[model samples]
Target: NINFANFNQDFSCVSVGYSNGYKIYNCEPFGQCYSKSDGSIGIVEMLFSSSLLAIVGMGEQHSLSPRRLKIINTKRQTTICELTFPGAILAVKLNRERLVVLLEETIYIYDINNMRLLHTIETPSNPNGLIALSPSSENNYLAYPSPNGDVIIFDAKTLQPTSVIEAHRTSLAAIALSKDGLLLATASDKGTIIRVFSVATGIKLYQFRRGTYPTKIYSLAFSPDNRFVIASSATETVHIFRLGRHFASLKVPASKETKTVVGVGSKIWDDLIPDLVNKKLVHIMVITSEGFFYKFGLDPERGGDCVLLHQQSLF
Candidate 1:
């Protein structure tokens, strides 16, 4: 059975899309919260920890069609609304105020409160469905790859264009927005350097070198504090790079690597306990496409390999 896994907005829950159905797992307690065997679901996105979910099927059957979008209530096992698009829905994003559905050439934005169409954006050929929403209501910014080596940032709330980020020379591989949508991270298809920029100013803040060789990036995530960024790639190792005060220094520290070769999916724990007497503790988690969960600890004082705290197979 094949599976697709992604963390929720707060990283407290992981939605796993399976060939038969989908299941939501709680990260802290490490248990399956709810699951349903409806059909083959390709994308399962949860709105925080709420019962609301934006699910798109794999198009295996009529009920499990990719062109249809279902807003379901997991608690009641009922679908609140169903929307069908002209093209297949590649991805969907949710925040408090908006619901974003991404297709190959078009993106739709709706008001979450009433599920009313608010805006429509015509994009270039986005075969991979590359898009990211702020996830925080403070700033409703949406980012996606451009035709050239650029990133287009749009204001979802105002329905206006924000700023263009000249991130890479080539097409982008992955893009991520900070929790507040104030920061943007982008990686090119070359996949050697990952750059972080200020969302408003379009100014590059930090650039971390992933490697000399080109690799496909699976995903990019920002820590809750906005001090660090993590990149998961096709390679076995994952990178945890620290954002520094100096914008473009001649010398930047390399990313902290993991020994284990994991899948493209990775996430940083949102809860960072700050102790005045002791050092701050950070939790790094990585989930694979094959249904394995990994937990590691990063001690800021010792900037070496992360210590594996827990490892379990989700299957």
Candidate 2:
């Protein structure tokens, strides 16, 4: 269940409507009292930070015009800063030092503490997506994919072009970098490709193809251990590719008498399941599509195993 609320009230539940504006539960309970005066539209995205919740609003046309960054105190629901920008804000990401805003063809960096504009960097092509990596770490960099299949890496601090690589031939829809900065992956109108690269030298080491069709890859995420890369496509499917065999030797447990399973089921019933009783194991991967998450486990003995974990349409 999703619990929607206003930032001000502590225990009161708030429900916002398209015509009635925001409804407070504690005050009116049934009637709508406090409606917005200027009809300035509602908030689009809300992100929780250390001491504030950052919010962005949509324009009358449902576009992000005059992008606003409002820091509301979680305790009081009071506005700390209402920052306004010129162009439409596509996306917003926050780090320790600054809040990064992705505009039309440029990226804006703002100081988090002082709320001052730090720098603005223009891209060679219109950016489709932007990702900010660790700044203090050695692999710290900014990954942005352009419309012309160019995946550019910029220094996180200086915002200077560090390296430019030909990611694809057509427009790149999405891009991602591994947590350790050892892998760089991109997906375009052609195909999804995962490229393992050296962070220091900016050299390509290996490449892996994910799919066959020219899928519009929208999202990419790396596993915590950096062993697997998951790409979400616009075709309503997700592909998981194994990069490193991190758990190659880990054996799948055999069905046996355990203290935890005593009250659950009988030993004979547990042993009857072939897939669960076997000890052979391979790799771990997962894919989410159409409100369903599928888990894929590789078994060296029988090749691999794919299973569905959960399914739903409510997102």
Candidate 3:
């Protein structure tokens, strides 16, 4: 058998909603690739058990046009049900028991096991299709961009409004959630500070400054222990912050020996990150639109800081 790790870069290229087909590659216990076929689907998703999968089909051109959302069973390899919407699907998320589909200005929630429409939410002019979902989280909070320079959060299960965070001085760029769904990381268009918020209360916990110059935040991550957080910015720097015991502190000092400038594609990134989290090491990396890749890591001895270690031009 061939080593999947050897083809790591190829795997990374396939995940960022790139590549040609929706082929499934199965390494069994090692890994599983979806073999069915991507077709003209712009966005695709699958459940944890692999019992079900979903996709949003579109036109044959290089862009999304026709609108069709479908859910399929991996074991059967047949579509169980389908749904259509006004606008094409922009983003998709398959959680423990929920399936979230995002459009230009709407969010649709359905049962993963059975295609049951539970909730429908209105959103801002999400032309970029930016949204964040907590897959392993049971809280069922769906976080997305709002028209008013904030994050519109809701409980996907209850279809109720939860915490609406006025996160930025300008529009928001991206949002991320901790594994346990207790902490949230947000980036703003102003690109000055990356803030941490409490899931339980929508209270601002900490704000890590990027720099005086305005730049976009490429990515953010929370450590496995939840005490450390990282942010990658446009100034070519990744900063890690130490969260006091339970996120009670607003500011943290930089770790003595912390920094990195590493990076990878969406798949390579998704693979490398959780691996870092597993080893009690806090690492953050990002490959921005400019093709500048950033990398980071933590020092267990000093604790709580992400330093720019290495950087390279992918171009």
Candidate 4:
């Protein structure tokens, strides 16, 4: 039971998911061509190559209400396109011509050659799949985390609907974008203030506090050369907020040092996968629950002098 595993967007390719199917490894010809065992595949992605794929079909036969999303092509194994969903499909993104789909409040858009559909927005409570994109192929943008407190931007090349950011009053629990996309990071759900925005003219950049208690922020990154931003929460620590105002905090390391036992649904493994094309992710690591999974760097020698770790730990 490991619903998903990472590495795409530049680590070549490696996705692992189990419960009945998901295995695609080909990091520069490492071998292990696709496999998507029917009836239970939480989400096994790998687009545009390795024979493209973007499946998602949860267990218990898809626990309650409409669900189905496939786009296979494991070297001619079938299913080129098919879509259906009313709810339940938390996330699935891919760019280079679009193909984003996530549901709860809504956000479905596709068309990466010919999967068509393209059009459907309307989100204000995206559950935990908040969403963010903008890896800048020279200025692309898309973000969401709106409960109306606002923080929604689009137009990753004509999806239109570009700005709505007011950013937090109580419901924006996480959202990040800045891989040369020009900065925009937000957090709210009481995770003690953290905001940065400006994707062309939504101005109000820089404002980080991070502590006043109120935990739970599991992820927020941005450092492909925007200086810094890596806020992982749920109280064990993993801050590293540095752009000059001096901020650092890290702790969430240890993937088998002691006290171990397993079997809760069989595997409850926590995660934090950040390595968006050499953007940087503190040494590369794993294992976490409650909240926290960040990765950012401009580390000027840890802010200049093996920096960032005042109350920090960069494993």
> Whose lDDT is greatest here?
1
Candidate 2, residues 1-315, lDDT tens digits: the string is: 221222121112222322212223221122333333222334322232134444555453342234665655545646677777766666665555556677777787767678788778776545444554432245556677755666777766665678877766777666666545656766666655645555556676667675565555555555545555555454544445566412121111222211010000001111112435644332232212221212233333333233322221212
* Order of models, best TM-score first: 1, 3, 2, 4
lDDT of 3 by residue, 1-315 (tens): 110111121112222122233433222112234454444544545454355555565564533334777666667767688777787777777677788888898888887667788888877688867777665556777788887568877787778888788888777876777656778888887778779998779899988776687876655666655666666554544566677622211121233222221222222122234425433333344434433334444544465444444453332
Could you tell which candidate, 3 or 4, scores higher by lDDT?
A: 4
- Over 4 Å off, model 4: 1-91, 94-153, 156-195, 198-200, 209-218, 221-230, 233-315
What C-alpha lDDT values do all the predictions have? 0.78, 0.46, 0.57, 0.61
* Candidate 3 residue runs with Cα over 4 Å from true position: 1-16, 23-41, 46-51, 57-66, 245-298, 303-315
- The window of 10 residues in a row where model 1 has the poorest summed lDDT is 245-254
For model 4 the local lDDT of residue 140 reads 70
Candidate 3 whole-model C-alpha lDDT, 0 to 1: 0.57
Query: What lDDT score goes with residue 234 in model 2?
Result: 48
Candidate 1 ranges with C-alpha deviation above 4 Å: 245-280
Model 2 gets an lDDT of: 0.46
Q: Give candidates' CA RMSD values in order.
A: 5.4, 11.9, 8.4, 17.3
Q: How big is the positional error of residue 41 in model 2, measured in Å on the Cα after superposition?
A: 8.8
